[PDB]
Amino acid sequence: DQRFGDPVFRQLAPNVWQHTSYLDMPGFGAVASNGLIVRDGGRVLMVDTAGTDAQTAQILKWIKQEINLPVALAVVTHAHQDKMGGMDALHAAGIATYANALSNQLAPREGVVAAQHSLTFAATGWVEPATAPNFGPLKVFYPGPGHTSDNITVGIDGTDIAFGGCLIRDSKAKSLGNLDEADTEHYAASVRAFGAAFPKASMIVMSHFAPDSRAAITHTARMADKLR
Ligand SMILES: O=P(O)(O)c1ccccc1
Ligand SMILES: O=P(O)(O)c1ccccc1
Ligand SMILES: O=[N+]([O-])c1ccc(O)cc1
Ligand SMILES: [Mg+2]
Ligand SMILES: [Mg+2]
Ligand SMILES: [Zn+2]
Ligand SMILES: [Zn+2]
């Protein structure tokens, strides 16, 4: 029988799915965490792990059974358990992993396994193409410090979709979540930069809420303005 801790999948576009897994840090309750699976020709690319290696394995199994194409690579959007909690699974599966250079530097401080490869960014925010080879439709943008110093974002070329990770909250959210590692001065402008980077994206995907309109960007930025 399917159970609560099992990952759930939603098709967002012909070649894109959202995976959601409900994980559980002590002190606090369990929370849902989302990433993406993208079909690019004869291969699959992932954005973020699940919050645990077990749930990540269950995703790779689903991918194998439902898509049956090899996962060529994964890009993980910052060094916290929810996005990088499944690095061991990805590496056991032979998947090439990519993260912000900064994420890889923070990973041992945050108790997560670093990605194999480091992305660097121009002063514009855009990934340097020599660090993101054969990314296909994944367009990686560093919007500046927000949720964390290292948080990155991903646009999906040929689609409606951009992925904001834990940077973005949905249009009904009443909080930005945990701010203990947030850059409260830069958060608002970073959210706006993400918006300006992906102006064609009408479907905003994010870590802890279901996909929303571009009003999630505005709503998140205007909550963040109150922190300055
Ligand atoms: O994450 P789920 O797709 O199982 C969900 C949960 C409550 C309402 C709608 C969808
Ligand atoms: O969204 P955060 O990266 O603050 C988080 C959420 C659940 C578990 C660990 C980290
Ligand atoms: O054999 N494995 O790499 C495993 C085994 C169990 C698990 O939950 C995840 C990965
Ligand atoms: Mg683990
Ligand atoms: Mg920490
Ligand atoms: Zn985080
Ligand atoms: Zn998160």
Swiss-Prot record:
Organism from which the protein derives: Klebsiella pneumoniae
Note: Enterobacteriaceae carrying this gene (identified by PCR) have been isolated in Sweden, India, Pakistan, Bangladesh, England, Scotland, Northern Ireland, Australia and the USA. The organisms they were identified in were K.pneumoniae, Enterobacter cloacae, E.coli, Proteus spp, Citrobacter freundii, Morganella morganii, Providencia spp and Klebsille oxytoca. In India most isolates were from community-acquired infections rather than hospital-acquired infections, indicating the gene is widespread in the environment.
Cofactors named for this entry: Zn(2+)
Top-level division of the source organism's lineage: Bacteria
Residue positions binding substrate: R169, N178
Activity: how regulated: Inhibits by captopril, thiorphan, dimercaprol and tiopronin. This enzyme is not susceptible to inactivation by the beta-lactamase-blocking agents clavulanic acid.
Protein name listed in UniProt: Metallo-beta-lactamase type 2
Record's subcellular location: Periplasm
Residues that, per the record, bind Zn(2+) 1: H78, H80, H147
Assigned protein family: Belongs to the metallo-beta-lactamase superfamily. Class-B beta-lactamase family.
Record has Transmembrane as a keyword: no
GO cellular component: periplasmic space
Gene Ontology molecular function: beta-lactamase activity; zinc ion binding
The protein's Enzyme Commission number: 3.5.2.6
Top EC class, one word: hydrolase
